[PDB]
Amino acid sequence: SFYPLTVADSQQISPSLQRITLQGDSIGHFTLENEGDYIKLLFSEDGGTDLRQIMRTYTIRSFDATNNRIEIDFVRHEQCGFAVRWAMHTAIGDTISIAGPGKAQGLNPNGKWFFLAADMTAIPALAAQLKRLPRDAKGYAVIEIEHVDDKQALQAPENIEISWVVKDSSTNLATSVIEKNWLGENGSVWCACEFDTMRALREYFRNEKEIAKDYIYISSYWKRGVSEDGHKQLKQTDAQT
Template identity: 40%
Template structure:
């Protein structure tokens, strides 16, 4: 197994983009050796057992909490790594990463592991659908920016409030649809509301666990989209920690594989 690489980074700046989205720009000498991270790549932010940011590489046997976030932008020339955080309320009850994102100040230090790469859109397609909640907004934004200019399709994003809308850079043929307080079934329902274009789509979706299952079922039952054209995943589960969610996600994937095989 490849040894995990750690990078010590400092907060360069912090900005509240919308009421429920915080942007942190990280920097540091370690970024010089940080691998190139394509759109949709992810990192692990390290916190100690008390939920405080881990400032140095963890020691053997030390209990570490890791939280996964999308690389919104990596600028090696400027020596910056940008990460956007969906905020889950106030205080420590919001979780270590959300709480840290709201309280972090320039100069604060945190250890980062990664990057890892996530599956993107199926390479062969006639049009695309990108959909997710605010936890997926950074990944969707990065993918939209990387799409060829002639791409057609939809970006459907569920947000907490009207004020969480933000400008997105996308090809002219992509219709951006904002769903405000759509609930767990809203993203799946949106697939029934849009006009499906001719040809074979590529679908990429990331959201809460129950929404993920609803989207997957809708694609299978209502549209019979080939599995090779679909990537649907959950980034979190209501009422569960990231470690618990990983277990749920693994069990669900096993059950689903057995069901469709």
């Protein structure tokens, strides 16, 4: 199933983020439970959206149940990418079709404390995880951004300490996650980020800190220097280990 949509709005929210709103009755069957699900943007091989198919995976940042709109937050990154190129050039009134939505493993709610980690590709998904936590949840959410102006107001339980880390030659998600004071056994982890940060933090959480598999979701959302079509293959290679 593919759903045709129209660009209803496009806003540069911060240096690294373009928020695009897509609208159409083809998604009127969505509900707010689809926030945080992933969808696939559909392109032809020539990079257009008028439909071999090239797909790109994005998160539903929000769903408006009044007028059938989703917001998608595109990292303004820069081989040229299909989705980012489309997002920076598209005009209100343009069209694109999507596939999905699908779901991924979530943060285990049975943790006694919670450790969430994200880079910019994963902020919409992280926000959905924060909204699902009970209001008394405790722990950390560590988020890597490329520019200080990329910080967002995120709704979170009061005792989830949110920290924003601006990437530079000495500052990054992996280092900042490892630096947090470990709060002991029974933690539940959710982490979505770039492939090599994922690998380092998977070793930290699973081996060094002994988190069992059902108390951690850790996933790569992209690999620097590789397009999504290669990244999906790299995931299969990484799974063989």
